[PDB]
Design an enzyme around this catalytic site. Structure first.
Site, mmCIF file in Angstrom:
data_model
loop_
_atom_site.group_PDB
_atom_site.id
_atom_site.type_symbol
_atom_site.label_atom_id
_atom_site.label_comp_id
_atom_site.label_asym_id
_atom_site.label_seq_id
_atom_site.Cartn_x
_atom_site.Cartn_y
_atom_site.Cartn_z
ATOM 1 N N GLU A 137 0.889 -1.189 0.000
ATOM 2 C CA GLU A 137 0.000 0.000 0.000
ATOM 3 C C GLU A 137 0.899 1.202 0.000
ATOM 4 O O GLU A 137 1.826 1.303 0.822
ATOM 5 C CB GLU A 137 -0.909 0.000 1.241
ATOM 6 C CG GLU A 137 -1.660 1.314 1.430
ATOM 7 C CD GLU A 137 -2.586 1.297 2.604
ATOM 8 O OE1 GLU A 137 -2.922 0.186 3.085
ATOM 9 O OE2 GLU A 137 -3.154 2.349 2.942
ATOM 10 N N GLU A 142 -3.313 11.274 2.866
ATOM 11 C CA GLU A 142 -4.464 11.065 3.816
ATOM 12 C C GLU A 142 -4.575 12.315 4.637
ATOM 13 O O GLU A 142 -3.549 12.990 4.869
ATOM 14 C CB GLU A 142 -4.279 9.871 4.775
ATOM 15 C CG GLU A 142 -4.142 8.609 3.986
ATOM 16 C CD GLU A 142 -3.895 7.442 4.932
ATOM 17 O OE1 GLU A 142 -4.821 6.882 5.543
ATOM 18 O OE2 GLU A 142 -2.670 7.047 5.129
#
Ligand SMILES: [Ca+2]
Length: 251
Positions: A137, A142
């Site tokens: 990932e 974010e």
């Protein structure tokens, strides 16, 4: 930085009106974990115009406080979770966006290995079946729900020769994330993965063959509500938007 990656191989400039282009974008709607998403998140994801639409030159993903049921599981918020139908190994990914301002929201721009075989994703077992975190990932962007003045870059993986879950990253300050566009980018090659906010490096992770970052990944775009990084959602939350002007990927 990133000038080596100069061949455009995938893009959406969002200069149409209506649903995200189905040749480019896949929607996830089936929850992976017995009716729920991971990370104690509070939303369902849907493919409805409620939660995503393209207009005025930009994609919007919209999270809403709305009771919604999918296969017997009721949640109190709806949102959208897109995956690119394009999978790629190495490149420079640029996403220009405005982020949600409201407490409780957890927007992300990120990748998974295409061998993730995540339930209801676009690739299934085409490339393999490496359950997260073994698929790898990369979190290009974010934000958590409680500090909209900082952005996150992060990595989650297990080494190919180990089951040990590794994770690390950085953060950087951001001004006016919700009212001004910024460009969130990745530069990924066999040597390293570098995540930037505009021209500022947020984190660089050295690559090697013992990582899951040398085989195809796909891009994800979503707003989660609550959960580990969304946090507490104010009772008065109504809706919020993550607005993306374009996605471009160069190799
Ligand atoms: Ca655009």
């Amino acid at each position: 930085h990133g000038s080596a990656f100069n061949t455009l191989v995938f893009s959406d400039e969002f200069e149409y009106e209506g649903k995200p282009d189905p040749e480019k974008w896949h929607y996830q709607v089936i929850p992976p974990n017995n009716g729920s998403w991971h990370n104690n998140e509070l939303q369902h994801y849907t493919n409805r115009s409620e939660n995503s639409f393209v207009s005025d030159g930009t994609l919007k993903i919209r999270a809403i406080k709305e009771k919604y049921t999918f296969e017997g599981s009721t949640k109190d918020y709806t949102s959208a979770r897109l995956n690119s139908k394009f999978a790629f190994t190495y490149g420079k990914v640029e996403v220009r966006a405005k982020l949600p301002s409201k407490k409780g929201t957890w927007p992300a721009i990120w990748t998974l290995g295409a061998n993730s075989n995540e339930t209801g994703n676009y690739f299934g077992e085409q490339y393999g079946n490496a359950e997260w975190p073994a698929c790898g990932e990369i979190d290009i962007l974010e934000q958590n729900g409680w500090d909209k003045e900082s952005t996150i870059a992060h990595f989650h993986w297990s080494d190919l020769n180990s089951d040990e879950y590794q994770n690390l990253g950085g953060t950087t300050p951001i001004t006016n994330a919700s009212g001004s566009f910024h460009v969130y980018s990745l530069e990924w090659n066999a040597s390293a993965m570098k995540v930037f906010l505009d021209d500022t490096l947020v984190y660089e992770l050295k690559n090697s063959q013992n990582t899951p970052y040398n085989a195809p990944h796909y891009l994800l775009l979503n707003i989660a509500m609550g959960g580990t990084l969304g946090g507490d959602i104010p009772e008065n939350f109504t809706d919020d938007i993550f607005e993306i002007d374009y996605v471009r990927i160069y190799q």
